[PDB]
Design a protein around this ligand. Structure first.
Ligand SMILES: [Mn+2]
Ligand SMILES: [Mn+2]
Ligand code: NA
Length: 249
């Protein structure tokens, strides 16, 4: 597979798209509360994005019917906004992608709905830290499998499981580009990271068993086979002379 190598001019564009994607996530926070629907949140983020001269990449992407993904509780990823009210104690991932001047910024976060219990809180914390362990190996000369190994080792040694079938990806003027960034792997295996690569790191971590099911009904929604909670965070990153840069802050 072909890995695109980027110039400084491209980093500039990615910083702007990343920032706008981050700010959308900052913006929606105060709106997440009990008895709000994910449809309301979708419209909020949709209008935030378009009023900043940008396009929501998920809208009609391979038919996806909405502008953001909202994944509640045992939903693992790509949950579709709907009319169901959020409940006190729920956890939700909101995943945004903006296209700004032709360049994609892709990021997701976990949100608490009302007062959340200790177990959900611990799951979210380990997920965030596992993501960061993956990002922290990134530098020219490190190997792609180093990323998945850091994530997997951290999650599993904290007593959680790693979702295998859905991955990070290259990104830039394209939403999903080469290579796949697996969230599991053996250390020191796979292609060599080079200065100027852009990609996402987006691990999904389950409280129960690692096994997931894709909805045949809507074709998008992934849930845990065992109905245990799952959490995810995502950043878009770039490889620099000194390691990594996170664009989605
Ligand atoms: Mn995303
Ligand atoms: Mn992504
Ligand atoms: Na979830």
């Amino acid at each position: 597979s072909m890995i695109k190598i980027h110039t400084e001019k491209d980093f500039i564009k990615m910083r702007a798209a990343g920032k706008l994607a981050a700010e959308t996530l900052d913006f929606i926070t105060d709106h997440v509360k009990p008895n709000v629907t994910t449809n309301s949140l979708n419209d909020l983020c949709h209008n935030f994005i378009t009023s900043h001269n940008a396009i929501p990449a998920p809208l009609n992407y391979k038919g996806f019917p909405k502008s953001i993904c909202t994944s509640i509780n045992h939903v693992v990823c790509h949950g579709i906004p709907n009319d169901k009210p959020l409940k006190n104690g729920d956890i939700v991932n909101i995943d945004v992608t903006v296209i700004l001047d032709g360049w994609y910024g892709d990021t997701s976060r976990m949100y608490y709905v009302g007062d959340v219990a200790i177990k959900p809180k611990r799951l979210i914390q380990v997920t965030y830290d596992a993501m960061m362990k993956g990002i922290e190996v990134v530098r020219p000369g490190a190997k792609l499998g180093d990323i998945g190994y850091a994530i997997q080792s951290y999650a599993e040694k904290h007593n959680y499981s790693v979702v295998r079938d859905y991955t990070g990806h290259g990104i830039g003027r394209v939403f999903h580009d080469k290579p796949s960034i697996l969230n599991y792997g053996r250390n020191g295996t796979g292609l060599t990271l080079k200065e100027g690569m852009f990609f996402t790191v987006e691990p999904m971590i389950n409280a129960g068993n690692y096994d997931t099911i894709l909805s045949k009904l809507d074709g998008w929604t992934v849930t845990t086979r065992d109905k245990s909670l799952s959490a995810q965070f995502e950043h878009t990153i770039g490889v620099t002379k000194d390691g990594f840069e996170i664009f989605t802050l």
